[PDB]
Amino acid sequence: GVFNFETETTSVIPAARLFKAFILDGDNLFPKVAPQAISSVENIEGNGGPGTIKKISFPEGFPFKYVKDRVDEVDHTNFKYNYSVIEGGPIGDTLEKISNEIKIVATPDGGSILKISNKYHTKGDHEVKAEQVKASKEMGETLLRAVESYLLAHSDAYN
Ligand code: NA
């Protein structure tokens, strides 16, 4: 079955720039700006669009060793990005995939709002509980703030 979770968060970075950096250039940025969160990102196959598979490895001591994420859809006009966690980490005999949707919208003050949906597709009769969702939110927030700090400090990056 499916467990649906949603959250929103804010950024001080304008939407288009944040989408170009945080969403479209994570493979480069996350290990650079948040090395204590992400040890590496490997592109396994594909050229960036639907179907691209990346292997995201976590540092030693983290709960999970890695996940593989698959890009589902990329909307450059509306700053929407869909991807799924398809292997590793929590994926296995209790959990088939986690499908995610991110949308970034501009705010009049020159920042943005990120709207995030996470849909857990379980196998069998298993509950997706609060702690698991909190950890994913914490990871996302950490990555966002690290990219935000980098973009504030490197004004010529991603214009
Ligand atoms: Na704002």
Author numbering: 1 to 159
Text of the article:
The conservative residue exchange Y5F led to a slight, insignificant decrease of IgE binding (1.46-fold). Because the variations in these protein structures are strictly localized to the immediate environment of residue 5, we concluded that Tyr5 is part of a newly identified IgE epitope and involved in antibody binding, which might be due to IgE sera from different patient pools in this and earlier studies.
It is the archetypical representative of the pathogenesis related protein family 10. Cysteine polysulfide bridging stabilized different dimeric assemblies, depending on the polysulfide linker length.
